[PDB]
Design a protein around this ligand. Structure first.
Ligand SMILES: [Cu+2]
Ligand SMILES: [Cu+2]
Ligand SMILES: [Cu+2]
Ligand SMILES: [Cu+2]
Lengths: 467, 467
């Protein structure tokens, strides 16, 4: 006669959800087949003075219930003062830690801070390589992204980016175009180490939040070198191998990198009305430039379809759409050409903004997020990835963040995070008829979440190809 | 075709669950009618450097969805080192904070630390007065409990307890009896403030855990004055008013206090093998003693039925049973007489221990917890409180903590907490047929939980009359 919540979990399958919690200072694994939290960790327990637990990704495991490993990073400094929490720690730790954690079937074990090992600290998106042999991190305060080895936590290659505006006034520095520099970043310390932990390398004193291109232009973001910011976000991976793609928010471009040869190969132009690409110019063995005549919109989410056939870059704020390239030629990214743009009245005004996406395994649909400042309901839009069309939107609640999918394609599992001070939850949506099945408690300010993959194939629709 | 978890919540009613997280550093409110966390708070944001968020209790609100207030305390110092977490913290805070927090319909707001206001910091159970005009806190390291005014956060009265063992060897200090002193504790600083914040007043360096009486007896608990310990736990309230009862773990007694007259009036004797009461002896206007010829077993949980007719104290470890007194004479607690003992052949070992309870509104049933160290399944026992017999025992999972009940009496909502490093969750049991309806995620190490009450009568089955 009474309803068992167990009936709800039974339908979901044997899948493990993991999410960090931003200001909660915690990270947590949840068994979607029973409702239990399997294990949680609090970084304060380890001496972390600013445990803003940020992005994460998990390596595949043959049985996540027996063990899995993941990478979760942190932010610090003035990132602590971004929200409507009246924080009282005026001088917090610097963050930019890159933690390696292993769930061992019972508990989470903090293995180390890869930022200490490598010397490179980075605080935005974390992704797993498609071979599950490494991971990558980006950062929009220091504009560096890097691919790291899973066994050693050392950098394989790191890239620094810089902006040289046509017009040396913050209001016009991006709109009126400029030249971006792509620079090979080499170790400066003994033992192959970098000297780029915590705040070292910061151009700006906090990460640009949604709409932050306007704040930086308006002189409202402090830092050493704001005129030269690009706000790198992520380093995402072609599921077919070989290529990694770095997203650059403020110049509205993605840079395609050859992973093994450690050179950029292509620059993709985000905004609608630009060509497919800009010309990459080699200056020397460590340095490349690209000239961008004007930037009519910043962009944000970048990622691939699970078959590598499509690459997507979201324009956000000044334009809101999804720019789509034909990346079917795996041999030569300079031939990748614009094939579609997803547009919709759902992209009402300056908001909502779409920062996250997940594909179905067969690549026919995608679930993308619709974020707004409080108090407009935030939610999910469903995209037809064959005809490049928005099918449906659903309203959920405050502060929508990331989306994952169970590896059978059946359920999208997302996080809402209360702007760090109000309502937060896990949402479950079924992909057959695109109905919201409801919410699970989650007292965490999640900016990321994954389902733990079992195979390399699973990684194609996990935190590897998209953010 | 798809099960909506919303159907599960629709059945529970409009009730708000609140729980702190111990090593998580956090506290959270959950809407049982939708699955959302309503709001959460991380005490590191407020400069707490040892945010072991410990016990708590909520005041009644006419509408918890619009606003409610609660009290949550903290522990620190060497309590950080008691669990399986390999903590690395070099200068941990001392804890013993007593935070006042207000939920305002959107977020949690830290109001203040009442230990700073009053000068008295206490780290174990927190309970609300039956009038909702005050709260009380106890502490088993300092052996102090006090009742505080809700508006001013100042002490109404405080009591300090001390053990004088017959035999001055830790192994025998309790088993061979002694004399406990009950002493009025008066302030020493300007403005009527105590000088007892943080570790000030600790006789031992951490709270005794389950079976901790063996630890202290074996010389394994550091402190300046362990021979003097009684391990106060709680100050619970007769729902009929007038009386408050302080539980003493190590001597196996409870002391009944006249709240308004500020005097003790009776000492109830815990273990099977003792009379109903021990004799209270007045030494002077501020000081009483009680002689205990032998402590047969330590005790723990203490509380009243919602009609105040029964009073219960659990014997734990050396005996595991529920000792029950006839407290129907509200005029004179010296008349309170043992009327029953709940016993089971399943409780014959050292474990399980039963540290928590909640009654149904009509006082006919009790839900009690069954705690064991890893890896024995912990769970809930259902007690017939008319005939004083065990009805049912259910296995749930690791590290069972507290119990609450919806105020219509339909659902028991408890917390399991992972020993701070493994699986944790909220459990829901329906009380009609005592079936476990299942679990909700809860990435917290809860040692307390409540449902926000609406009325004074609701408190009778909240964190007021029992722990
Ligand atoms: Cu991003
Ligand atoms: Cu973020
Ligand atoms: Cu207790
Ligand atoms: Cu506790």
């Amino acid at each position: 006669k009474y309803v068992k919540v167990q009936d709800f979990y039974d339908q979901l399958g044997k899948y493990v959800l993991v999410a960090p919690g931003k200001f909660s200072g915690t990270v947590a694994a949840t068994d979607l087949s029973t409702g239990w939290t399997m294990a949680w960790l609090a970084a304060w327990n380890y001496g972390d003075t600013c445990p803003i637990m940020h992005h994460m990704a998990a390596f595949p495991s043959p049985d996540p219930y027996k063990e899995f490993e993941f990478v979760v990073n942190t932010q610090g400094g003035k990132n602590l003062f971004i929200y409507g929490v009246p924080v009282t720690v005026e001088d917090p730790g610097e963050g930019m830690k890159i933690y390696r954690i292993k769930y061992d079937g019972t508990r989470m074990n903090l293995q180390r801070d890869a930022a200490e090992v490598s010397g490179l600290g980075l605080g935005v998106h974390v992704t797993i390589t498609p071979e599950a042999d490494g991971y990558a991190v980006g950062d929009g305060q220091k504009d560096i992204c890097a691919e790291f080895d899973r066994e050693t936590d050392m950098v394989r290659y790191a890239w620094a980016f810089d902006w040289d505006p046509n017009v040396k006034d913050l209001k016009r520095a991006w709109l009126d175009g400029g030249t971006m520099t792509i620079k090979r970043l080499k170790p400066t310390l003994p033992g192959g180490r970098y000297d780029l932990q915590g705040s070292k390398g910061n151009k700006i004193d906090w990460e640009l939040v949604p709409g932050g291109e306007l704040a930086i232009e308006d002189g409202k973001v402090s830092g050493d070198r704001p005129l030269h910011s690009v706000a790198n976000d992520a380093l995402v991976f072609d599921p077919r191998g070989k290529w990694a793609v770095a997203s650059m928010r403020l110049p509205g471009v993605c840079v395609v990198f050859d992973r093994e040869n450690q050179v950029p190969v292509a620059v993709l132009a985000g905004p609608k009305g630009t060509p497919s690409q800009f010309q990459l110019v080699k200056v020397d063995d460590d340095t490349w430039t690209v000239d961008i005549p004007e930037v009519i919109s910043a962009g944000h989410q970048a990622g691939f379809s699970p078959d590598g056939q499509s690459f997507l870059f979201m324009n956000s704020l000044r334009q809101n759409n999804i720019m789509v390239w034909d990346s079917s030629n795996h041999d030569d990214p300079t031939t990748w050409e614009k094939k579609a743009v997803v547009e919709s009245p759902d992209w009402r005004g300056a908001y909502p903004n779409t920062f996250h996406m997940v594909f179905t395994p067969d690549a026919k649909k995608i679930y993308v997020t619709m974020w707004w400042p409080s108090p407009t309901p935030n939610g999910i839009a469903v995209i037809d990835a064959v005809n490049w069309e928005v099918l449906k939107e659903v309203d959920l609640g405050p502060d929508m963040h990331t989306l994952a999918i169970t590896y059978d394609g059946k359920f999208v599992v997302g996080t809402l995070s209360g702007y760090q001070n109000t309502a937060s939850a896990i949402v479950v949506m079924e992909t057959e008829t695109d109905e919201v099945l409801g919410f699970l408690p989650s007292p965490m300010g999640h900016h990321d979440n994954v389902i733990v993959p079992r195979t390399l194939e699973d990684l194609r629709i996990s935190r590897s190809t998209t953010t």
